[PDB]
Amino acid sequence: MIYSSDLNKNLASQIIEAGTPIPGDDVVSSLKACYQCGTCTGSCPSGRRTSYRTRKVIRKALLGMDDVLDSDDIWKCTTCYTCYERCPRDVKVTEIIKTIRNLAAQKGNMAKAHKMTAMYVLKYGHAVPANKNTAELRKSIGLSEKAPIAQFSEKDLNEMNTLIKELGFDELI
Amino acid sequence: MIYSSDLNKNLASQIIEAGTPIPGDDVVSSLKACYQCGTCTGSCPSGRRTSYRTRKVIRKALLGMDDVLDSDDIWKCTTCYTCYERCPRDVKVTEIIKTIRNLAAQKGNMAKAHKMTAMYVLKYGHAVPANKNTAELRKSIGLSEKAPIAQFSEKDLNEMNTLIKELGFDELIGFDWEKGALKE
Ligand code: SF4
Ligand code: SF4
Ligand code: SF4
Ligand code: SF4
Ligand SMILES: [Mg+2]
Numbered sequence: 001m002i003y004s005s006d007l008n009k010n011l012a013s014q015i016i017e018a019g020t021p022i023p024g025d026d027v028v029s030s031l032k033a034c035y036q037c038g039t040c041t042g043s044c045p046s047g048r049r050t051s052y053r054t055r056k057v058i059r060k061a062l063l064g065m066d067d068v069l070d071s072d073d074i075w076k077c078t079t080c081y082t083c084y085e086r087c088p089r090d091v092k093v094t095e096i097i098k099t100i101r102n103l104a105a106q107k108g109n110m111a112k113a114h115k116m117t118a119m120y121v122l123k124y125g126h127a128v129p130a131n132k133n134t135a136e137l138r139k140s141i142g143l144s145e146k147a148p149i150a151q152f153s154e155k156d157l158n159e160m161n162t163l164i165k166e167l168g169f170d171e172l173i
Numbered sequence: 174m175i176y177s178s179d180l181n182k183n184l185a186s187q188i189i190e191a192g193t194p195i196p197g198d199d200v201v202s203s204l205k206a207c208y209q210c211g212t213c214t215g216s217c218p219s220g221r222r223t224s225y226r227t228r229k230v231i232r233k234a235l236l237g238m239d240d241v242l243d244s245d246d247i248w249k250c251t252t253c254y255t256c257y258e259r260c261p262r263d264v265k266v267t268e269i270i271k272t273i274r275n276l277a278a279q280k281g282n283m284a285k286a287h288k289m290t291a292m293y294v295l296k297y298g299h300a301v302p303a304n305k306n307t308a309e310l311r312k313s314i315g316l317s318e319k320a321p322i323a324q325f326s327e328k329d330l331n332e333m334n335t336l337i338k339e340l341g342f343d344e345l346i347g348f349d350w351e352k353g354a355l356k357e
Contacts, residue, residue, distance in 0.1 A: 001221055049174075
């Protein structure tokens, strides 16, 4: 039983707001063109082995069911862009899902594993940083012991941190 | 994922077959006129407090999902006839649900409580038979100690017992006459 009291009339507008200016007002606004045909759901590789239905994410955004932000299903999207490519109403589906994930992240719905990966990029500058075995491996192949990356350039590490602090990505985590 | 191999293309026809001649071929074949509008679901008293969705029953019958016969949901219908009354395609919804319940009963999907009630009607002739307290209550308010009903007429009790046997309703509920109770 869904009552008007259980719905947020501004959900779509709030999703568009979050998607402005990146990926864009026009891009996220495309959710309003959806005519619930299901082409996205039938194209979804994740939907073939789970309860995830791409079309229902857009339906819930239009209807105002904010529980979609607390959903585990929105995080089952692999961003394969098959829905995006086949949508007959030009809905930028994959981008709307990512924008919805941003609001889910703001509300605290981030899996610990994802927060760990984000922490590695902040601390070490890389999601998959170099290990002790890495240096040994690279030398044997005939490459530099350490790659020319941010993990070893103190300048770049502090640059990323000031940006992460300015964006509040640290507080998001 | 639903494949063609998971569906029964003859489900609708089998539901209509069961509904022939009672309540009628025309009545049960009305399921084929459904256009999935949901008026029945929005009208359903049971759907407001459960996962039961009246149009999904008709959808599953048309699609060929026979798991609908194993469903607990079809037994949540109170037969209020609100869907029947409001259907814009004249689908005799309540009758289709009852016919689907007949196939569910044939497959063994019947509750002991319902089987107990059916057993009381063939054994004592009544779903709620008279007790010792009935005789006391009735005579205390001017009524006959025993009502003029089948429970006290061996003639009418035997008539029903012959019809029950002819219809095979005794076999359906699993009632044995020698044992005098529901088998298994
Ligand atoms: S495909 Fe485009 S239009 Fe059809 S449902 Fe998915 S999003 Fe809405
Ligand atoms: S992008 Fe996400 S949603 Fe669209 S199809 Fe690939 S997985 Fe399913
Ligand atoms: S109301 Fe009549 S038509 Fe509309 S869904 Fe229920 S049965 Fe099908
Ligand atoms: S008749 Fe059965 S299904 Fe139709 S509304 Fe009343 S309860 Fe719901
Ligand atoms: Mg979903």
